[PDB]
């Protein structure tokens, strides 16, 4: 144990700091300073405003005695002469202890519970540890949520990162609240939440759910509201991910985290890039989201090392009811499947308004079958999907002038779709749906066809579970 004690004892000397002047100009969130000696890279600098206010920023691009620093707390009201800068000679550090749970922090990760500071057991970085690909393991032990359409058509396993697509005015927040409230194994979860650019009512709602649920002592939160400066929003995800990684790989807990709104984050990145002169990408967005978003999502899953697990549930807002937009388009390639909520279903009063056709999961094979579930699950899901698509096609055909070219299969799929939606899809805010009962409901819906159209099912399952 002396190794870490001596490692800390290495950082046991006072390091004097410089103090600069002569800000050669400022443009928007970007500050131009040209007098620096030996400017380092990716370091935090404290700025003292003429009124004595202290702010901090990070360097972006260096040059021969020329540095460019963004400001996390805006840029209004700064004087060329009556402003000073100090250099700390370090990247953005962060304190960590085993005692952040139940504490709320602002965008810049400061306590906002009227309590003291963290008094961390150790400091850490926000971008370090590029996890070795070799040691990583893949998810198993399919994770249960109590929601049928989530746990059946797009079943997921612990340690799998997956986002949620959403659009204006849709009930995704309480959906995630229900998920986290009633999520568990199939036979407990430290929760880390990060907010960014959200209306205060949403944060109040989430806090109400967590404290109400009694899980507040099992979680820690980071808060960054819309009224707060945009630039701060490019830091909170890193803070949350660092917290989660430390709690998983050194505190050894099964952890789930929920990133709040990537749309605002991407917009802020676009704005900061636009501040500088850069050849814009498609739609004017900076040409290199991919790297940043990967660095964001890559942290996930478990490793051979120990028991600590990590799970990501980023939440995205759909700009104009399309996935072709650069943000969702890019997000698709990086993560395992995505859950989708559609406009029409919500306008139909169906909760959750989940549309399965666009949604999908990228890992069930280790999360299905017997030993954990009933073997029928795969065929059940596949057949239901096929008949759902067929019913959609029949409905589309019906729109021409009517049932001019109509078949019995068309009517069959019609009632199948109708009953499926109105009964299986509609799950109440507290309607627990165990895998067994969900499959029983699916099978009951399956007893609507002869034993001939069910081609995507093994005869063994068909015989043993068509009737009992």
């Amino acid at each position: 144990f002396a190794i870490n004690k001596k490692a800390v004892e290495q950082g046991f000397n006072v390091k004097p700091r410089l103090n600069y002047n002569t800000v050669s100009g400022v443009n928007g969130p970007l500050v131009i300073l040209e007098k620096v000696k030996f400017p380092r890279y990716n370091e935090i600098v404290n700025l003292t405003l003429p009124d004595g206010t202290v702010r901090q920023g990070q360097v972006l691009e260096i040059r021969g005695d020329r540095a460019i620093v963004q400001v996390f707390e805006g840029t209004s009201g700064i004087d060329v002469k009556k402003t000073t800068v100090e250099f700390t000679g370090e990247s953005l550090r962060i304190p960590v202890s085993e005692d952040m749970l139940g504490r709320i922090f602002d965008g810049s990760g400061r306590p906002i519970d009227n309590g003291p500071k963290v008094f961390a057991e150790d400091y850490l970085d926000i971008n370090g540890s590029p996890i070795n690909p070799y040691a990583r393991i893949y998810p198993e032990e399919m994770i249960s949520t109590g929601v049928s359409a989530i746990d059946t058509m797009n079943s997921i396993a612990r340690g799998q990162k997956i986002p949620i697509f959403s659009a204006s005015g849709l009930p995704h927040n309480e959906i995630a609240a229900q998920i986290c409230r009633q999520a568990g194994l199939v036979r407990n979860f430290s929760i880390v939440f990060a907010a960014m650019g959200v209306n205060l009512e949403t944060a109040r709602f989430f806090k109400q759910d967590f404290e109400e649920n009694g899980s507040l002592e099992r979680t820690s939160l980071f808060l960054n509201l819309a009224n707060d400066p945009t630039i701060e929003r490019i830091i909170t995800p890193r803070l949350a991910l660092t917290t989660a990684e430390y709690l998983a790989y050194q505190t050894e807990r099964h952890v789930l985290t929920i990133l709040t709104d990537m749309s605002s984050y991407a917009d802020a990145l676009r704005e900061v890039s636009a501040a500088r002169e850069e050849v814009p990408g498609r739609r004017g967005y900076p040409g290199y989201m991919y790297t940043d978003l990967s660095t964001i999502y890559e942290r996930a899953g478990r490793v051979e090392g120990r028991n600590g697990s990590i799970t990501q549930i980023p939440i995205l807002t759909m700009p104009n009811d399309d996935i072709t937009h650069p943000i969702p388009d890019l997000t698709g390639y990086i993560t395992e499947g995505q859950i989708f909520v559609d406009r029409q279903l919500h306008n139909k009063g169906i909760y959750p308004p989940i549309n399965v056709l666009p949604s999908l999961s990228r890992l069930m094979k280790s999360a299905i079958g017997e030993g954990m579930t009933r073997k029928d699950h795969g065929d059940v899901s596949n057949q239901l999907y096929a008949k759902y698509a067929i019913g959609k096609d029949a409905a589309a055909m019906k729109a021409v002038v009517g049932e001019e070219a109509l078949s019995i299969e068309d009517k069959l799929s019609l009632e199948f779709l109708e009953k499926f939606e109105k009964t299986f899809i509609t799950q109440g805010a507290y309607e627990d749906r165990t895998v067994f009962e969900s499959l029983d409901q699916a099978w009951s819906l399956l007893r609507i066809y002869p034993k001939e159209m069910l081609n995507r099912i093994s005869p063994k399952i068909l015989d043993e579970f068509y009737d009992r």
Partner: protein, 51 residues
């Protein structure tokens, strides 16, 4: 035969007259709308690149 043939003639003529001026114009306008969208996007991207 007269009765049946009259019925089917009525059905087919009604459907044809509908499709004549109920389905076509919607798509006719939609194509031009999407074309205008794409043209505007082209112009704005060109302006960015020229800048």
């Amino acid at each position: 035969a007269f009765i049946i043939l009259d019925e089917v003639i009525k059905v087919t003529n009604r459907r044809v007259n509908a499709i004549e001026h109920v389905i076509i114009p919607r798509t006719e306008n939609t194509i031009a709308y999407i074309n205008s969208e794409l043209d505007e996007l082209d112009r704005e991207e060109f302006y960015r690149l020229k800048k």
